[PDB]
Amino acid sequence: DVQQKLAELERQSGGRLGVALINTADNSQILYRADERFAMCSTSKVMAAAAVLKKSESEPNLLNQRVEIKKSDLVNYNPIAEKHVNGTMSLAELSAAALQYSDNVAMNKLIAHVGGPASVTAFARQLGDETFRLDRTEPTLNTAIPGDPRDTTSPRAMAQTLRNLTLGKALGDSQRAQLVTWMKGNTTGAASIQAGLPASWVVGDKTGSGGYGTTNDIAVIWPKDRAPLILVTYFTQPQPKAESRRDVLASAAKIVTDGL
Ligand SMILES: [Cl-]
């Protein structure tokens, strides 16, 4: 019956909706188009950040290393990096900027540090994720062209990976905690999955948007007095200039958590 309501939601929205919920209470899943590929857009910032955190388990001072920010590094959306031009930022700072403000320079700096999009992809493979692929840098990774496999993953794979990163042992204790802390500090997702959940639940999420009105949110959710959930909501639309539909994500979140 949940599937019915997601299909009716997708029908009303006019686009293509991919949902994957893992309920860690009973290891159950709600899947909707969960094996289809969707452009990740900024939700891929989580994988780049984790790649850097993983590197730091072997290089402890890594997060304190400084990277220069120049005008040549600016792209389309640099809310934090633009304040630091001609200075340096630590990788920890860049990680926080990418995850909490969706800063695209920060993402490009993380990508560069671990050796480019193919290295981020190789990191995901090491975690058991054979679906994720990051192909391009910012800003082109957000084109979200229908049919284009570049910079895509599936809801099911991102839910399982995010589970590994945030609730599992893919990262060391210090590093997993850092990742969850950054995500719980996100500033950009109050209108997406969070908007479909009770005020009392705690969310750490990473949003994403791009071409074809693509609107995404990935989240680890701590309900009150319940085991955590992982929720992936991906949404994309037929028109290239379509507007973002964060409300669709909020409705999906409401639909699949009704009864928890
Ligand atoms: Cl409420």
Numbering used by the authors: 29 to 288
Provide the authors' own sentences about this structure as they appear in the paper:
To demonstrate the application of the drop-on-drop method to enzyme-catalyzed reactions in crystals, we used two different enzyme systems as case studies: hen egg white lysozyme (HEWL) and a bacterial serine β-lactamase (SBL), CTX-M-15. HEWL is a widely used model system for crystallographic methods development, while CTX-M-15 is a class A, extended spectrum SBL that is distributed worldwide in multiple bacterial pathogens where it is responsible for resistance to a range of β-lactam antibiotics with the exception of carbapenems.
The basis for the poor turnover of these last-resort β-lactam antibiotics (for example, ertapenem) and the mechanistic details of inhibition are currently not well understood, largely due to the lack of structural information. Based upon the limited set of conditions tested at SACLA, the HEWL results clearly demonstrate that the drop-on-drop mixing method can be used for mix-and-diffuse studies of ligand binding to protein crystals on timescales down to at least 0.6 s after ligand addition to the protein microcrystal suspension.
